[PDB]
């Protein structure tokens, strides 16, 4: 209700005020980007420290077996040396008795040579009395019971160890023509335009649980208590994708377990996140398909198209920003058709997801 | 009363013994081989039972290499789980950055043309835009799981320690030289040492032999060795393996429970049977003897009742070159028990007697 230079100034002044805050927002993000990569290294070392902590503990056990291994071996070589040393003795005992009898042999063999003599009789009359006797070796048996007992205890230790290792591990003219082409395509042709959808933790409602590198959304039993945020849903149990699309062709698949109270779709970034109006299908900025008591319905702007119920529980969604259509498919083996929308879109679209029945779960597919 | 017939009656029965002695000697030669073969027989049985354990321990070593990698995989999975979520959240933050970077440039572009009237119009829509700062959610590493693996691995170490214990616990001028030798010290006497070996042929049925045949002791039951001419039948005696007729010799004997036992020397000719075989009671045996802890030197049924002594190691010295045998008492120093001055007729074997159920004679090898 005024002038030029003052309006130019009233703009310019409050305009750069936001620019100066955006610097500190962006540098506030840049710090958080660094904190994450630092925190990855922080964990990477904590892994190695707990691994090296086990590499010690296993080497302690490995050395304990090297003790017992030598300790049982010593025992066997002692029993070996005991017996083999007795043979080294008995060999010497026999050896003496041999050369003893070898002498009396030669004493007789020498005396026989001179049978010229009369005193052949005299020199051998004393030799009549000598009478040698044969050698003998006593009972030298190796202790089998002791050596079989060690082996048996060592066999027992192997199957005692096996027991305890288990106890560790066990516990329009062009536009319409292109639509028809895409409507008739097969699963491999649709998968050429794939993009890995990522869930956004900013967007997820308090009772929506996110997991598996933020690719699995499900119903929470308790409120998860995320931070308050403008982009977070306050009324309805909803969550959005990370990336939005205004140019090109896109496709993604979603697996829906316990298909009872859940829904998949697309949404403009402008859609309000708060109040009952934020609910998907009930405004001008959201197109989706939805299950309610296992009855399939396509929704947009408070309008219900009650569809035929289907077997499949993998929903493939295709989007064409170049021409202007979004298509919903049912996938079990083949590609069945659920519904389509013919729209020239105003702005970029984020993928959109809803889940309500305590059990339902939406998962991004990457085949 | 004839020559050639006596020469023949000798010659005939003489070579009969010679021909038997061949078969005796070849009968020994076989036994010499049997022993050395039986040593090898045991030596392989040792290695086979050792190699049998070397397998069994390596089986256990590999079992730990499995669990070691199996628990490590589990930790690296929990690492990758968390680090992959950061790789996501980095991309989530990255989008929110460039999102706000755009609206910055949209505003920075619009400021340049403040010449225009439509500076107001083109930035009136830009008034409403309001960016908000980033946030990182709770990404905490599962400590309970990693401490639990470590605790079970600590438990396995002390479970193993338990069972390694269960392996090992259940298996539990003549006159002038005499005087010189009489005055010698223990190191000088030990220069003429010879390791005495007991002879199993000689030992009486109630005399037990052990420790590579160097320890004689009283048997409780009759040991029932083979019958042999050289074995004692009456008295509890045993002799040495080697006999000595030339040179100087020495040996030490430890006598536990010195009550009814005795040490000495003996000629090979001594008869082993009957009461006469007893050591000290004939012309072929010299010895020292304990009877009710009273020391006596004996030879040919003659007693010299000596002074009782403290020591229980008897050192015996023999001099075949000159002709004397000496008995010493040894505890720390070398005390003298008795001597014999004899020009010996033939070679001497060391000789030993034990009778009190408990007494034990052991050869010392310092």
């Amino acid at each position: 209700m005024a002038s030029l230079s003052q309006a130019s100034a009233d703009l310019e002044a409050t305009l750069r005020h936001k620019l100066t805050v955006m610097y500190s927002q962006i540098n506030g993000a840049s710090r958080a980007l660094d904190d994450v990569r630092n925190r990855q290294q922080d964990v990477r070392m904590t892994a190695n420290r707990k691994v090296e902590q086990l590499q010690q503990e296993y080497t302690e056990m490995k050395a304990l077996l090297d003790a017992s291994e030598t300790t049982s071996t010593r025992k066997i070589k002692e029993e070996e040396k005991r017996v083999n040393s007795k043979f080294d003795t008995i060999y010497q005992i026999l050896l003496k008795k041999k050369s003893e009898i070898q002498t009396l042999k030669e004493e007789i063999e020498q005396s026989l040579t001179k049978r010229d003599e009369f005193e052949f009789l005299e020199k051998a009359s004393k030799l009549r009395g000598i009478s040698t006797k044969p050698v003998y070796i006593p009972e030298v048996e190796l202790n089998h019971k002791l050596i079989k007992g060690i082996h048996q205890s060592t066999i027992d230790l192997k199957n005692e160890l096996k027991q305890c290792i288990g106890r560790l591990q066990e516990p329009t003219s062009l536009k319409a023509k292109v639509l028809e082409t895409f409507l008739a395509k097969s699963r491999p042709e649709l998968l050429e335009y794939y993009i890995k959808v990522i869930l956004d933790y900013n967007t997820a409602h308090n009772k929506v649980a996110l997991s598996e590198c933020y690719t699995v959304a499900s119903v929470a039993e308790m409120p998860q208590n995320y931070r308050p945020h403008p982009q977070r849903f306050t009324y309805c149990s909803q969550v959005l994708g990370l990336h939005c699309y205004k140019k090109g062709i896109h496709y993604w698949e979603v697996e829906l377990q316990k298909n009872n109270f859940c829904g998949v779709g697309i949404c403009y970034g402008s859609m309000n996140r708060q109040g009952p109006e934020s609910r998907l299908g009930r405004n001008s900025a959201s197109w989706c398909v939805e299950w309610f008591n296992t009855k399939i319905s396509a929704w947009h702007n408070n309008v219900e198209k009650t569809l035929p119920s289907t077997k499949a529980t993998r929903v493939g969604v295709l989007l064409n920003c170049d021409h202007g259509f979004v298509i919903f498919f049912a996938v079990a083996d083949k590609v069945h058709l659920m519904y389509k929308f013919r729209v020239d879109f105003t702005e970029a679209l984020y993928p959109a997801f809803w889940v309500f029945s305590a059990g339902a779960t939406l998962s991004i597919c990457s085949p």
Side-chain angles (χ1 to χ4, degrees), chain A residues 216-236:
Chain A
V216 176
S218 54
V219 182
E221 297 202 61
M222 262 174 61
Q224 300 299 285
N225 296 344
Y226 303 95
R227 287 173 176 72
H229 198 248
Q231 298 190 294
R232 194 170 313 286
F233 295 99
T234 60
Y235 183 85
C236 44

Short mmCIF file of all heavy atoms in Angstrom, two decimals, chain A residues 216-236:
data_model
loop_
_atom_site.label_atom_id
_atom_site.label_comp_id
_atom_site.label_asym_id
_atom_site.label_seq_id
_atom_site.Cartn_x
_atom_site.Cartn_y
_atom_site.Cartn_z
N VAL A 216 13.10 -50.09 4.04
CA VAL A 216 11.99 -50.89 4.56
C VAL A 216 11.19 -50.10 5.60
O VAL A 216 11.69 -49.81 6.68
CB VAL A 216 12.50 -52.20 5.20
CG1 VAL A 216 11.36 -53.00 5.83
CG2 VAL A 216 13.24 -53.04 4.16
N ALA A 217 9.94 -49.77 5.25
CA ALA A 217 9.03 -49.07 6.16
C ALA A 217 8.01 -50.04 6.76
O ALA A 217 7.52 -50.93 6.06
CB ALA A 217 8.31 -47.96 5.42
N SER A 218 7.68 -49.86 8.04
CA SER A 218 6.74 -50.75 8.73
C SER A 218 6.04 -50.08 9.91
O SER A 218 6.43 -48.98 10.31
CB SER A 218 7.48 -51.99 9.21
OG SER A 218 8.60 -51.62 10.00
N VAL A 219 5.03 -50.74 10.46
CA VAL A 219 4.25 -50.17 11.56
C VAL A 219 5.01 -50.29 12.88
O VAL A 219 5.44 -51.38 13.24
CB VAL A 219 2.87 -50.85 11.72
CG1 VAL A 219 2.06 -50.19 12.85
CG2 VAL A 219 2.11 -50.83 10.40
N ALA A 220 5.16 -49.17 13.59
CA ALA A 220 5.78 -49.17 14.91
C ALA A 220 4.74 -49.43 16.00
O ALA A 220 3.58 -49.00 15.88
CB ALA A 220 6.47 -47.85 15.16
N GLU A 221 5.14 -50.14 17.05
CA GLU A 221 4.26 -50.44 18.18
C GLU A 221 4.22 -49.27 19.17
O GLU A 221 3.14 -48.86 19.60
CB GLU A 221 4.69 -51.72 18.89
CG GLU A 221 4.61 -52.96 18.00
CD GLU A 221 4.51 -54.26 18.79
OE1 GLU A 221 3.54 -54.42 19.55
OE2 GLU A 221 5.41 -55.12 18.65
N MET A 222 5.39 -48.75 19.53
CA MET A 222 5.51 -47.51 20.30
C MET A 222 5.80 -46.34 19.35
O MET A 222 6.28 -46.57 18.23
CB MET A 222 6.63 -47.61 21.34
CG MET A 222 6.18 -47.97 22.75
SD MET A 222 7.57 -48.26 23.87
CE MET A 222 8.43 -46.68 23.86
N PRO A 223 5.53 -45.10 19.79
CA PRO A 223 6.00 -43.94 19.03
C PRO A 223 7.53 -43.88 19.02
O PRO A 223 8.16 -43.96 20.07
CB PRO A 223 5.42 -42.74 19.80
CG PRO A 223 4.26 -43.29 20.55
CD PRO A 223 4.65 -44.69 20.91
N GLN A 224 8.10 -43.75 17.82
CA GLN A 224 9.55 -43.80 17.64
C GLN A 224 10.28 -42.52 18.06
O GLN A 224 11.50 -42.53 18.22
CB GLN A 224 9.91 -44.15 16.19
CG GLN A 224 9.38 -45.50 15.72
CD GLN A 224 9.92 -46.67 16.52
OE1 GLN A 224 11.08 -47.06 16.36
NE2 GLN A 224 9.08 -47.23 17.39
N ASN A 225 9.53 -41.42 18.22
CA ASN A 225 10.07 -40.17 18.74
C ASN A 225 11.26 -39.67 17.93
O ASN A 225 12.39 -39.60 18.42
CB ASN A 225 10.44 -40.29 20.23
CG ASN A 225 9.24 -40.58 21.12
OD1 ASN A 225 8.09 -40.40 20.72
ND2 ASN A 225 9.52 -41.02 22.35
N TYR A 226 10.99 -39.34 16.67
CA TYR A 226 11.94 -38.61 15.84
C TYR A 226 11.87 -37.14 16.24
O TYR A 226 10.97 -36.74 16.98
CB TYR A 226 11.60 -38.75 14.36
CG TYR A 226 11.53 -40.16 13.81
CD1 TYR A 226 10.30 -40.84 13.73
CD2 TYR A 226 12.66 -40.81 13.32
CE1 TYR A 226 10.22 -42.12 13.21
CE2 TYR A 226 12.59 -42.09 12.79
CZ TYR A 226 11.36 -42.74 12.74
OH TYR A 226 11.26 -44.02 12.23
N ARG A 227 12.80 -36.33 15.74
CA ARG A 227 12.76 -34.88 15.99
C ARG A 227 11.55 -34.23 15.30
O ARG A 227 11.15 -34.68 14.23
CB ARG A 227 14.05 -34.20 15.52
CG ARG A 227 15.24 -34.47 16.39
CD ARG A 227 16.49 -33.91 15.75
NE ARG A 227 17.69 -34.05 16.57
CZ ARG A 227 18.34 -35.19 16.82
NH1 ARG A 227 17.92 -36.35 16.33
NH2 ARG A 227 19.43 -35.17 17.59
N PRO A 228 10.96 -33.19 15.91
CA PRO A 228 9.94 -32.41 15.18
C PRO A 228 10.54 -31.69 13.97
O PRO A 228 11.65 -31.15 14.06
CB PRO A 228 9.45 -31.40 16.23
CG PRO A 228 9.77 -32.02 17.54
CD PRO A 228 11.05 -32.77 17.32
N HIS A 229 9.81 -31.70 12.86
CA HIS A 229 10.30 -31.20 11.57
C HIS A 229 9.12 -30.77 10.70
O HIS A 229 8.05 -31.39 10.78
CB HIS A 229 11.10 -32.32 10.89
CG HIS A 229 11.99 -31.84 9.79
ND1 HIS A 229 11.78 -32.15 8.46
CD2 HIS A 229 13.11 -31.07 9.82
CE1 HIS A 229 12.72 -31.60 7.72
NE2 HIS A 229 13.53 -30.93 8.52
N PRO A 230 9.29 -29.73 9.85
CA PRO A 230 8.16 -29.33 9.00
C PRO A 230 7.71 -30.43 8.05
O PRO A 230 6.51 -30.64 7.87
CB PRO A 230 8.70 -28.14 8.20
CG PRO A 230 9.91 -27.68 8.92
CD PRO A 230 10.48 -28.89 9.59
N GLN A 231 8.67 -31.14 7.48
CA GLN A 231 8.39 -32.20 6.51
C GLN A 231 7.83 -33.50 7.12
O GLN A 231 7.39 -34.38 6.38
CB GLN A 231 9.64 -32.47 5.65
CG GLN A 231 10.06 -31.24 4.84
CD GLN A 231 11.13 -31.52 3.80
OE1 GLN A 231 12.26 -31.85 4.15
NE2 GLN A 231 10.79 -31.36 2.52
N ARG A 232 7.80 -33.62 8.45
CA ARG A 232 7.23 -34.81 9.11
C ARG A 232 5.70 -34.78 9.17
O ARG A 232 5.12 -33.74 9.47
CB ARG A 232 7.78 -34.92 10.53
CG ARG A 232 7.53 -36.28 11.19
CD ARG A 232 8.29 -36.46 12.50
NE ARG A 232 9.70 -36.08 12.39
CZ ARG A 232 10.65 -36.78 11.75
NH1 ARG A 232 10.38 -37.94 11.15
NH2 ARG A 232 11.90 -36.30 11.73
N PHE A 233 5.06 -35.92 8.91
CA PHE A 233 3.60 -36.06 9.00
C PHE A 233 3.17 -36.13 10.46
O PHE A 233 3.75 -36.89 11.23
CB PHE A 233 3.10 -37.30 8.26
CG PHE A 233 3.32 -37.25 6.78
CD1 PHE A 233 4.40 -37.90 6.20
CD2 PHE A 233 2.45 -36.54 5.96
CE1 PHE A 233 4.61 -37.86 4.83
CE2 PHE A 233 2.66 -36.49 4.58
CZ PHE A 233 3.74 -37.15 4.02
N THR A 234 2.15 -35.35 10.81
CA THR A 234 1.66 -35.28 12.19
C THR A 234 0.39 -36.09 12.43
O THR A 234 0.21 -36.65 13.51
CB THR A 234 1.43 -33.82 12.63
OG1 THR A 234 0.45 -33.21 11.78
CG2 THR A 234 2.73 -33.02 12.57
N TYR A 235 -0.50 -36.15 11.43
CA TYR A 235 -1.79 -36.84 11.56
C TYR A 235 -1.71 -38.30 11.11
O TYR A 235 -2.07 -39.20 11.88
CB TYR A 235 -2.86 -36.11 10.74
CG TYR A 235 -4.25 -36.71 10.88
CD1 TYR A 235 -5.09 -36.36 11.93
CD2 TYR A 235 -4.72 -37.64 9.94
CE1 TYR A 235 -6.36 -36.91 12.05
CE2 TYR A 235 -5.99 -38.20 10.06
CZ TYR A 235 -6.80 -37.83 11.11
OH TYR A 235 -8.06 -38.38 11.22
N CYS A 236 -1.26 -38.51 9.88
CA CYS A 236 -1.35 -39.81 9.21
C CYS A 236 -0.01 -40.57 9.19
O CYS A 236 1.06 -39.96 9.26
CB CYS A 236 -1.86 -39.62 7.78
SG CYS A 236 -1.06 -38.22 6.96
#
